[PDB]
From a paper:
The program of herbicide development described herein aims to identify inhibitors of imidazoleglycerolphosphate‐dehydratase ([name]; EC 4.2.1.19), an enzyme of histidine biosynthesis in plants and microorganisms. This enzyme catalyzes the manganese(II)‐dependent dehydration of (2R,3S)‐2,3‐dihydroxy‐3‐(1H‐imidazol‐5‐yl)propyl dihydrogen phosphate (2R,3S‐IGP) to 3‐(1H‐Imidazol‐4‐yl)‐2‐oxopropyl dihydrogen phosphate (IAP).4 [name] shows strict enantioselectivity for its substrate, with the other three diastereoisomers of IGP acting as competitive inhibitors of the enzyme, thus indicating that the active site shows some flexibility to accommodate inverted chiral centers. Previous studies have shown that [name] is inhibited by triazolylphosphonates, whose potency is based on mimicking key reaction intermediates. In this paper we describe work on the lead compound, 2‐hydroxy‐3‐(1,2,4‐triazol‐1‐yl) propylphosphonate ([name]) and present a series of structures of [name], from Arabidopsis thaliana, complexed with a synthetic racemate of [name] and with the enantiopure compounds.
Significantly, the mirror‐image packing of the two enantiomers of [name] in IGPD2 gives rise to equipotency and, as in d/l‐AOPP superinhibitors of phenylalanine ammonia‐lyase, the mimicry of a reaction intermediate gives rise to potent inhibition. This study adds to the ever‐growing body of evidence that certain enzymes are chirally promiscuous and that mirror‐image packing of ligands is a more common feature than is generally recognized in the field of drug development.
Author numbering:
A (entry chain C), B (entry chain A), C (entry chain C), D (entry chain A), E (entry chain B), F (entry chain B): 1 to 176
Amino acid sequence: MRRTTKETDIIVEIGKKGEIKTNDLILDHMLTAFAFYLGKDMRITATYDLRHHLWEDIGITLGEALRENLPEKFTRFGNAIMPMDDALVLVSVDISNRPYANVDVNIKDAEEGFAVSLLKEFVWGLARGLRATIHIKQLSGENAHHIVEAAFKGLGMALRVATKESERVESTKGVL
Amino acid sequence: MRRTTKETDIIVEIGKKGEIKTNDLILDHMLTAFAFYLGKDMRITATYDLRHHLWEDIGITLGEALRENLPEKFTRFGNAIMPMDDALVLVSVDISNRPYANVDVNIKDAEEGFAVSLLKEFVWGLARGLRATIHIKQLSGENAHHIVEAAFKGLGMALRVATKESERVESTKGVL
Amino acid sequence: MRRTTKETDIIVEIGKKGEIKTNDLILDHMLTAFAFYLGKDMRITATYDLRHHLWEDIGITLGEALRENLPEKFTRFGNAIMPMDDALVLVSVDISNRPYANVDVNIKDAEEGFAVSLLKEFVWGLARGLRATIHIKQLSGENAHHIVEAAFKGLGMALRVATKESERVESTKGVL
Amino acid sequence: MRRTTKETDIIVEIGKKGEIKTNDLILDHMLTAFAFYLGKDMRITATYDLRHHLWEDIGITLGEALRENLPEKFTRFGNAIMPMDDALVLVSVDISNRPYANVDVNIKDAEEGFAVSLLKEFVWGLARGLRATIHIKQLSGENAHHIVEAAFKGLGMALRVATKESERVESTKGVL
Amino acid sequence: MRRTTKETDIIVEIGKKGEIKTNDLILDHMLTAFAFYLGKDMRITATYDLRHHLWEDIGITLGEALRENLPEKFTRFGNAIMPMDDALVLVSVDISNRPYANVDVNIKDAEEGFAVSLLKEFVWGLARGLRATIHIKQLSGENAHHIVEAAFKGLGMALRVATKESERVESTKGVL
Amino acid sequence: MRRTTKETDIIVEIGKKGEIKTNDLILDHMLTAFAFYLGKDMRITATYDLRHHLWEDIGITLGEALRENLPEKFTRFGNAIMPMDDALVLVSVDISNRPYANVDVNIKDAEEGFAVSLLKEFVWGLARGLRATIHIKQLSGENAHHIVEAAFKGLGMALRVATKESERVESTKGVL
Ligand SMILES: O=P(O)(O)C[C@H](O)Cn1cncn1
Ligand SMILES: O=P(O)(O)C[C@H](O)Cn1cncn1
Ligand SMILES: O=P(O)(O)C[C@H](O)Cn1cncn1
Ligand SMILES: O=P(O)(O)C[C@H](O)Cn1cncn1
Ligand SMILES: O=P(O)(O)C[C@H](O)Cn1cncn1
Ligand SMILES: O=P(O)(O)C[C@H](O)Cn1cncn1
Ligand SMILES: [Mn+2]
Ligand SMILES: [Mn+2]
Ligand SMILES: [Mn+2]
Ligand SMILES: [Mn+2]
Ligand SMILES: [Mn+2]
Ligand SMILES: [Mn+2]
Ligand SMILES: [Mn+2]
Ligand SMILES: [Mn+2]
Ligand SMILES: [Mn+2]
Ligand SMILES: [Mn+2]
Ligand SMILES: [Mn+2]
Ligand SMILES: [Mn+2]
């Protein structure tokens, strides 16, 4: 899937053997973690003007790509609790068709390239593109890289669960 | 436009002279204010199980109806500052394709039938159905009815502006 | 229009080329600002015993004069945000037939002749004579003259909007 | 199973396709969520005098019905973390034969029909009827309906796990 | 118009279709937003030593170019309230011939390339080159890019209003 | 496997049906819980001088024995949330080859034989022998025995998950 604006040009191809090359080494690493714990190969390429636009538009495109790949009847709910050294991060997803993100982190030891702004904009992008409810809740930790990487690992693991096929439409209201 | 779940059954028809009859007298009043200040006739009918499901699903259906009704090129931005006796409420809308709501109110004198829960759920529904950014920011006020009605009046006025036809795609990124 | 008591004798004639001469140089200046931003010539003359009675009775007479000049179907709502150097003042008017004034200012650097008492009594007079809801909300500023003059400039601009002719009775209740 | 007092008359039949009709529309909705996420059809009918007696006695009767339905050797432990928009609620169950409930919620935006009293009394009833340890721990959230519905969804999911057949008596002390 | 010092060399040509290329990608994006919402084509090119000198001198030069472009009699006042996701920013301009800037923002989630220092210096440069009073007041928000971009969008929209032709000298003192 | 120092002499044999007999009745009970929820038979015998050296060295030896027992490719991650009456304890494990323990508990009602010192030293021993990251985070609770026992139950359950065979090396860096 390709999404192109005047700001960014992004390809996300889920289930395809390929490199993740966004021209942002931090995001390449985070997306590698996400794909690995999701349990899917993917090819991702991007060009961009500003890193915010990249992280957001990657979130949106990835979310749309996951939505396109979603079985007609899907599990809907998935969670992960991801430790990474000092970090302990809860990730909870509901593929609800109600875009919402709540990212609650507390970075004590900052690291160049890792920013809460960028994390939040990726997650809101993902929530909007997938049309999902996403909570990221830090339970412990100080290190920026461990916290953010735990969040991406957790997103991958939670979405592994939530995107599996189900026998039914997973809502009491009869529609998702 | 009709939206039907096991919880609610809603029809919203913009531009048709008709009744607003939701079987919730508070919501009927608030929607009447909204339609009046938007400057458009509309017919709205609904059945529901619980009031929260009604307020939310009315927001969603109304938002989708407004989105369907938009000119290809639209003004995108609209604001209103709405006084109502003690209440003074700022409503700011960006038809951004990025669902978001922030409803920041402070009700001192409560009134039966008016609930922040219901206002928030309508606004989030509208933000999700229209695919828009919506801020409701109370500047002054105490009375629940004045605050909530000012918000609905302000939403009508802000959307009156934001849904008008434009000569261009109103985004520097070239797409909405 | 003339209003005469044992305390004051006031003439306000809107749409007439003339001087504003109240025998209070501060009020003459504030009224000049008001008329200029309203976009109307006016003639105003007054005699008075005490400045409070002047500012109040000018408010009342001006409000009655605006009410007499109001089209049968009028726009009802008008706002202004007026910067003046350090001052930034929001003025929001609803010609509601529900007299109410809320003047929320915070003068740090006082100036002879400018008093919150006098401002409040003018505004309450205006609200009572016009039969309107009036909010003045200081958003920024320290200087008494800039804050009060911004309020009068803003009143003029807000009433310019609110006193324009409309195609309809601007109330969902069918009466104003 | 039928439980009858001078206050309430309740039938709960697990595994029968049937209606959930308690004459309380909120509880009907919450029980529908519970049964849906438990993954079991059930028929529930009730009459009652006061809502508290209904919520409590429904908990008791449902708990007894679940206890009667358990395989001799059961999994005992089950958890769910349930997001619902702003709400994020942890539900942790141990079918311990030691009745206990701790419901730790924080409702900011109240909603008519939803009460912490009623939630607590249902959960304590369920803990006493099933003979179980039940924690409901709010991690995030403001909305009453989202919080309470997340708790019922989470209870269904947690009990789905805890009520599954096991190869052994799940206790180091050799008895449950 | 061209402005050259030992620090910077800047060309701003309002009304010419052309590139905005300052050798600062963040400023290019912000000026693109500014020009788009002002509603005028412009060509802007720059070289510079240090980003602060660029942002400031661009503000000065753009301000001078706008001043040169004004009709003899101009509207003087303009406002915008600009939402951008979480951000909600008020921009209020008075082309007063009294240089003044007050930039009141609160960035919670910082982003590389975006700095309050640079925003303030651009706005002070603009106020000084145009000879204007400029308030930027954040009402809501956390994200640096959303806040700063909302300010530039808002400046564009406010100056669109303020730079229009008027029938009169817009001052009670008879000169601007 | 056997580990002998001048302080302790410990045998841990995973997969062998046998006694857990450490000459510390509290540790015997905790290890019984651990083994039961891990789902593996084991024989553990020990002699010791001081209880701290026992708890630590048991942790080390058990960790080494688990490490020796791992398949070449293992699941790596495992979590448990364990209620025990008032206690609710999160246990999160990553068999990371990066020894780390964070035991975050809050015992209100102390009990003879149970000490935070001993729990921490067991967990650090285990993290160091297995070469793993281990978080024990109390979410609720007062009673020492319930809290500590929930931690051991949870460690068993979490390691049941983490020690299973995987089809791949579970790390984006390609080595563990
Ligand atoms: O989570 P869902 O949509 O499956 C069912 C809910 O009952 C719908 N809802 C949304 N807000 C309150 N209720
Ligand atoms: O508001 P838009 O989408 O027209 C242009 C913005 O540049 C896009 N954006 C979204 N977050 C940061 N920038
Ligand atoms: O503002 P109005 O009078 O047009 C209509 C309102 O519904 C009347 N009202 C006055 N208080 C509460 N409602
Ligand atoms: O949780 P159980 O009943 O399987 C075993 C526990 O050892 C019993 N216990 C209850 N309080 C303290 N210990
Ligand atoms: O805003 P202006 O210059 O049009 C007229 C003001 O009265 C001048 N002024 C400046 N400070 C106080 N008053
Ligand atoms: O958790 P791992 O070792 O599988 C991969 C991580 O990227 C390595 N890392 C360790 N600290 C920061 N990153
Ligand atoms: Mn963004
Ligand atoms: Mn890493
Ligand atoms: Mn809802
Ligand atoms: Mn009303
Ligand atoms: Mn008085
Ligand atoms: Mn003056
Ligand atoms: Mn009771
Ligand atoms: Mn519901
Ligand atoms: Mn400078
Ligand atoms: Mn941008
Ligand atoms: Mn030690
Ligand atoms: Mn015990």
